[PDB]
Design a binder for this molecule. Structure first.
Ligand SMILES: CCNC(=O)Nc1nc2cc(-c3cncc(F)c3)cc(-c3ncccn3)c2[nH]1
Length: 184
């Protein structure tokens, strides 16, 4: 299932080049866009963090955490273990703010490192996905381009007016850059 994504990456994302690397971001952002189109999220945040980790945050309902009829595993674990981004990431973390609780799970090459755990309390709702693209899959470059992400984030904000979409570059902690889009 998920081992097939690691052997044929291009079959799922197109290429293991700069284009494919950026497609990973788009596959996570699209989920937050779906949550905004469903009527629950109105704020999306994309962060290029240190060592080219990507953090995508929305203020939707939070990916469901309820135990399933099929697996006996939380809905979020089922969803993430079928995720191409998760399969192609050397590391991926999830934080779900839901039911006044903060739930967390980490994966390595799509494989869960521990069971979903409650790690805090919250008055907010939403999902946080942090991932570090697998450097063995992505050989050409693992370095994100700001202008490529910005150009697309601005188009998404224009296609989904009323949704606040923010892009931040934190790779240089001494010089942080931010572009926030919010069309009326
Ligand atoms: C950072 C990436 N953001 C998300 O993945 N946001 C997100 N919010 C969700 C809410 C529901 C959701 C919550 N409550 C009730 C529902 F019916 C759906 C379901 C999903 C989901 N479902 C299938 C695949 C991927 N994501 C969400 N993703």
């Amino acid at each position: 299932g998920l081992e097939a994504v690691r052997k044929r990456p291009g079959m799922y994302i197109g290429s293991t080049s700069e284009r494919g690397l950026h497609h990973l971001v788009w596959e996570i952002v699209d989920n937050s866009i779906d949550e905004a189109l469903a009527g629950y999220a109105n704020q999306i945040e994309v962060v290029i963090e240190k060592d080219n980790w990507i953090k995508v945050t929305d203020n939707g309902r939070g990916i469901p955490v309820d135990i399933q009829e099929k697996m006996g595993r939380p809905a979020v674990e089922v969803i993430l273990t079928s995720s191409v981004v998760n399969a192609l990431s050397q590391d991926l973390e999830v934080y779900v703010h839901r039911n006044e609780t903060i739930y967390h799970q980490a994966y390595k090459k799509g494989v869960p490192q521990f069971d979903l755990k409650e790690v805090g309390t919250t008055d907010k709702t939403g999902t946080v996905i942090r991932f570090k693209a697998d450097g063995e899959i992505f050989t050409e470059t693992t370095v994100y381009n700001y202008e490529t992400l910005q150009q697309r984030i601005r188009e998404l904000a224009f296609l989904n007016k009323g949704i606040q979409i923010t892009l931040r570059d934190e790779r240089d902690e001494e010089n942080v850059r931010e572009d926030s889009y919010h069309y009326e």
